[PDB]
Amino acid sequence: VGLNPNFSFRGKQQTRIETFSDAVFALAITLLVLSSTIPETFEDLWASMRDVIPFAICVALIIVIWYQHYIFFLKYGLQDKVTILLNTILLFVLLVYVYPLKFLARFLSEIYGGIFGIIETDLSRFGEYSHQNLKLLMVNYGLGAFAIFLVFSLMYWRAYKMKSLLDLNSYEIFDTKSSIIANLLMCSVPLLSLIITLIDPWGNFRTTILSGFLYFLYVPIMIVFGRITSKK
């Protein structure tokens, strides 16, 4: 149930911030699926079932955020203005990226569909695939991911700033410090794509290849940033 055996969970009682938060997460994953049109005919029914792969990817992504949220509020049981503020920023980012994720997930499902050879349907429905549009694709979703992890870092730092008020022990202080580092390291990868895309060194698709390729090397690049700080 819990992550650490040395952590004393201050947020076992459910609060308004957590209840409100659960409503928003449930609404996000629910409206992602149920924002679709109701099938009126067999043809619509089969079309609607092609959407499950894109939705599975979106849902998986949202619960992962929900989990991090659950663990934070479980650890610290925080309920102050600044926690409320940072919490709102988080849910706000989530909300604005629900329908854009539905889009990205459908787009990438067609691209990966073409590769593997499952389907051969058109991508002209998405509009023109231009350099500017493919760059804005990275910058958009990259800015989204960066923000979510950035906010999680700020939230843990707020708990670190209230370590004494929360009566955090040496183990708990260490966890909190490690959780900040983790979230900043997570945020760094989308920050690096975003910056590379915005400068655009090549002036062509090469930029987008590199930017996209940093996510495939998430684990190794995270280890490099972590190793640089430990080596000094």
Added chain:
Amino acid sequence: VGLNPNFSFRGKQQTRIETFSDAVFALAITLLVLSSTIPETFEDLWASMRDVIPFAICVALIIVIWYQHYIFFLKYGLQDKVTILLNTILLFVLLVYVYPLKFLARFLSEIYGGIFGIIETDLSRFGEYSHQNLKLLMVNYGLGAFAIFLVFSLMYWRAYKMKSLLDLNSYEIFDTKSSIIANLLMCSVPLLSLIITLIDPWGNFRTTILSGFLYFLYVPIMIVFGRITSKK
């Protein structure tokens, strides 16, 4: 976590009125964002991202109301008919002003966009900008703001009326009295714009300038009303 150190929080346990209320607040902020159309193409995606500034302003506004709600139910733990009634009136006002806020936020974002020089898109989409329409804009949103603060004053007065039943101490009585004054003072500013607009002294845009200008002088005008009652 708490506002006052002398206040004994009667509403630390979550109740049905608070749970129901959280659902409504979550739904308001969620449907504000997710009432938009799902992007089907890159062009829609970029259009949808122009909506984040208007949404941030709306969201910020709604959580501020949610916070006041959280603090009230935390303070008194009330659950009676009259509290339910006043609570419903509040949520009702909120709900009817969700989509109108989306509108106002988009409108003002274009007006402020033009000023700063970020964008140069048309305002003809909003309809004709006539004196009658710009007056109704003030009266509408002014009536909304007035009501929210009016209801918060009534809610605190209901707690004041039940001071003995709630076993309120001298510090808590003082807080409650101060919270009534605060909410009436907050309500006064939209009440003053609304009245000025409805009388319409100039018979032209000048009326709307003054009415709109009272919100920019919120803090100072609130201090004048507060100073008048203390001076006698």
Added chain:
Amino acid sequence: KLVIWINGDKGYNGLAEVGKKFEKDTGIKVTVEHPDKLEEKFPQVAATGDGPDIIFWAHDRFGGYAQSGLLAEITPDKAFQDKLYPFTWDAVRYNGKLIAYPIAVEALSLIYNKDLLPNPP
């Protein structure tokens, strides 16, 4: 009689409970005393008179006692030595000789009333 000198702001009652278990297992009396200005009363009394058997104070005062010849050299076996952190032993060393037994590290902190001040300076 085993006499111990420790400051009055410390846990002399608890130190006595250890002393009471010692008498049960040996037969020696363990009285615990806490006199005022013991840091500057010890080097005067212990030099001339008898004073205490064992003196408890922060390590900083012990070098002066060691130079003056007011303290016996500590000779603890490896197994006892190994029970304590090696950095702690360094604090109780003067001219390559162990002059005391390290007990605990002490540092001042900001003690605050959470009710009167939730977010202290």
Added chain:
Amino acid sequence: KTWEEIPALDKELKAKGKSALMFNLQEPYFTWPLIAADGNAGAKAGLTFLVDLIKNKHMNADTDYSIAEAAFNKGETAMTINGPWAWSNIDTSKVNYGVTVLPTFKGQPSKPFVGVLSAGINAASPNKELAKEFLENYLLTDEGLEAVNKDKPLGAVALKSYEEELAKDPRIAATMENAQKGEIMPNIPQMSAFWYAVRTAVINAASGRQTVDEALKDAQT
């Protein structure tokens, strides 16, 4: 919140085998707030109401401190009028009680008299300096007033050091509320003759001997 809505409440409660309000009618200190609510015309109004309560069989004729206290603590009456001192006996009983503002009469509030519990030294005492020691260094201290207060509550203590503790008590708040709506009694030598005049007046009107108009006539003399 009003005196005038007690008869309705009493009708409701008497059906369920319970009284609405029982308080000491014998001692005029308890009846004075109702009498002095408006004010004369005010004394005539306030007393006539009190007379009508006994005439309508809502309150008993010879209601005293003991049968009122006992009835409230037993759980027979829904309300009672009393001071800080009475709280401890309620706590002893299993009655979830509240202390609040006295009911209003003719819109205006009921003005209860305010007393300052005070310790004086007898002029014909040889232990004047020993009593001063007791009063100053032992009684009028944080520790001293605490001891008295945990037995039977003193109310709003005169000690400056006790402000925080007083302010934390909801019953004290209600006491101070009523004290502000009332007024401090003058210490004058005529207070004795005054109190006697009111004590008789209230008893006569309660029992059914003298009229409300004739009660104020004999009392003003």
